[PDB]
Design an enzyme around this catalytic site. Structure first.
Site, mmCIF file in Angstrom:
data_model
loop_
_atom_site.group_PDB
_atom_site.id
_atom_site.type_symbol
_atom_site.label_atom_id
_atom_site.label_comp_id
_atom_site.label_asym_id
_atom_site.label_seq_id
_atom_site.Cartn_x
_atom_site.Cartn_y
_atom_site.Cartn_z
ATOM 1 N N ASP A 12 -8.184 28.355 61.455
ATOM 2 C CA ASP A 12 -9.270 26.790 61.058
ATOM 3 C C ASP A 12 -10.575 26.732 61.799
ATOM 4 O O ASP A 12 -11.407 25.930 62.075
ATOM 5 C CB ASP A 12 -8.358 25.800 60.965
ATOM 6 C CG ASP A 12 -7.271 25.037 60.414
ATOM 7 O OD1 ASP A 12 -6.377 25.385 60.267
ATOM 8 O OD2 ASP A 12 -7.800 24.066 60.064
ATOM 9 N N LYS A 15 -14.289 30.843 58.770
ATOM 10 C CA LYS A 15 -13.961 31.676 58.519
ATOM 11 C C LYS A 15 -14.556 31.662 57.004
ATOM 12 O O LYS A 15 -15.671 32.288 57.041
ATOM 13 C CB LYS A 15 -13.039 32.383 58.599
ATOM 14 C CG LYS A 15 -12.892 32.463 60.355
ATOM 15 C CD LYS A 15 -11.385 34.304 60.255
ATOM 16 C CE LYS A 15 -10.689 33.813 59.753
ATOM 17 N NZ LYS A 15 -9.898 32.201 60.081
ATOM 18 N N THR A 16 -13.557 31.186 55.985
ATOM 19 C CA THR A 16 -13.814 30.715 55.230
ATOM 20 C C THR A 16 -14.977 29.539 54.470
ATOM 21 O O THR A 16 -16.245 30.589 53.273
ATOM 22 C CB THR A 16 -12.671 29.871 54.185
ATOM 23 O OG1 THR A 16 -11.299 30.826 54.637
ATOM 24 C CG2 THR A 16 -12.279 29.895 52.514
ATOM 25 N N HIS A 69 -3.912 35.403 60.495
ATOM 26 C CA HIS A 69 -3.326 37.123 61.388
ATOM 27 C C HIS A 69 -3.441 38.008 60.704
ATOM 28 O O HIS A 69 -3.291 38.988 61.021
ATOM 29 C CB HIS A 69 -2.754 35.765 62.459
ATOM 30 C CG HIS A 69 -3.429 37.300 63.874
ATOM 31 N ND1 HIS A 69 -4.207 37.315 63.974
ATOM 32 C CD2 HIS A 69 -2.099 37.919 64.518
ATOM 33 C CE1 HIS A 69 -3.834 38.363 65.077
ATOM 34 N NE2 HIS A 69 -2.136 38.133 65.212
#
Ligand SMILES: Nc1nc2c(ncn2[C@@H]2O[C@H](COP(=O)(O)OP(=O)(O)OP(=O)(O)O)[C@@H](O)[C@H]2O)c(=O)[nH]1
Ligand SMILES: [Mg+2]
Ligand code: NA
Ligand code: NA
Length: 377
Positions: A12, A15-16, A69
């Site tokens: 959260d 990154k995206t 992760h």
């Protein structure tokens, strides 16, 4: 002129959003563009990973972005991430979190050469003192895992406000893309790295000594040049009497070529599985090393029970299996399937080694895990 990067960071932390912003901003400016829904939904030992493409006027980039992760551990261990440099995403809201440190640690352990920091969610931060504290915390965190914290580029920004269109924030995405060019150096091409040929097969040929076959991973082997057979036993030294590709006589063996290297005085029975051909004094044989391993889960076709200190599996280094004893970290009692731990490996035979070399952990010819050579001992 292609370079491989990736977005590393805590769940959260944006990154995206950053990956999508990078593609869209460079598309508006130089050329191209991908959106959140495209990168969040990642394709594909189950490693779910999105592979994005973007261009700078001077370089081409392949980018990796994973949902959680698990996929970052898996990609860094299995080498599949191919990172020439990473982009650490830290939220100015939360700051370095457990996965931020674990990603820097694994970065040191898998040999990620360069880390650049993007300080996201600045649109949500109104105090300057807060951003400097988050930045210092990151500088502190990088230098702990031997990264150049004081020389690391840290770009303040908002991946979302730049994604939306706000021109002030698109300037920070371009700043980031600049450090992807100025700060990640051009990776050394294999033909320039000293000669390395993993011996895949061996034959006693008619009136011309012994032939060692395999693919040239690095550099060049010239006819007449001195060579070394490093591996399973004490280092033997030979001379390259010839290089043959199929029935074609050659004088050079270039990186990425499947050749046959004719050796002087070496005999078919003195060549072992797992041995290599190297430029003298460029690779040393090791038995003991520190590792970073990922053990396959039941739903990955791995072990269905845990293993302990007495575990003795096979380690597929390049061409063969080599049995090894393990040393677990203090306070580490056992390894469950699907786990990720550090481990000291002690091989029965020495293998030519240097940090970064990958292996597969096996049990009776089936892969049960994967590792990286963190530190040779
Ligand atoms: N305010 C603000 N929110 C952001 C920013 N970047 C990302 N977010 C939001 O933060 C949330 C999570 O960010 P993601 O892009 O999904 O980050 P992630 O690391 O891929 O993690 P996942 O949420 O688990 O998929 C989303 O709702 C984003 O809209 C930013 O610059 N500003
Ligand atoms: Mg994501
Ligand atoms: Na010769
Ligand atoms: Na392997």
């Amino acid at each position: 002129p292609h370079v491989n990067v990736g977005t590393i960071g805590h769940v959260d932390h944006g990154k995206t959003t950053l990956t999508a912003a990078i593609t869209t901003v460079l598309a508006k400016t130089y050329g191209g563009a991908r959106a959140f829904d495209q990168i969040d939904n990642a394709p594909e030992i189950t490693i779910n990973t999105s592979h994005v493409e973007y261009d700078t006027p001077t370089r081409h980039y392949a980018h990796v972005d994973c949902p959680g992760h698990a996929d970052y551990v898996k990609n860094m261990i299995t080498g599949a991430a191919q990172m020439d440099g990473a982009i650490l995403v830290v939220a100015a809201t939360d700051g370095p979190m457990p996965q931020t440190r674990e990603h820097i640690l694994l970065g040191r352990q898998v040999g990620v050469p360069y880390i650049i920091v993007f300080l996201n969610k600045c649109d949500m931060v109104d105090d300057e003192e807060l951003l400097e504290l988050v930045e210092m915390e990151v500088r502190e965190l990088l230098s702990q895992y031997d990264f150049p914290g004081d020389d690391t580029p840290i770009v303040r920004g908002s991946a979302l406000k730049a994604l939306e269109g706000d021109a002030e924030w698109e300037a920070k995405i371009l700043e980031l893309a600049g450090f992807l060019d100025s700060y990640i150096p051009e990776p050394e091409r294999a033909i320039d790295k000293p000669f390395l040929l993993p011996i895949e097969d061996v034959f006693s040929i008619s009136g011309r000594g012994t032939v060692v076959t395999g693919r040239v991973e690095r550099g060049i082997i010239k006819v007449g040049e001195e060579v070394e057979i490093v591996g399973i036993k004490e280092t033997q030294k030979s001379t390259c009497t010839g290089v043959e590709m199929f029935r074609k006589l050659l004088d050079e063996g270039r990186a990425g070529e499947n050749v046959g290297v004719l050796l002087r005085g070496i005999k078919r029975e003195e060549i072992e599985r797992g041995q290599v051909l190297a430029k003298p004094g460029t690779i040393k044989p090791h038995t003991k090393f520190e590792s970073e391993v990922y053990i396959l889960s039941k739903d990955e076709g791995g072990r269905h029970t845990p293993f302990f200190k007495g575990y003795r599996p096979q380690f597929y280094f390049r061409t063969t299996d080599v049995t090894g004893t393990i040393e677990l970290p203090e306070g580490v009692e056992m390894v469950m399937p699907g786990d990720n731990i550090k481990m000291v490996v002690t091989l029965i035979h020495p293998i030519a080694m240097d940090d970064g070399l990958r292996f597969a952990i096996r049990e009776g010819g089936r892969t049960v895990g994967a590792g990286v050579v963190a530190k040779v001992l």
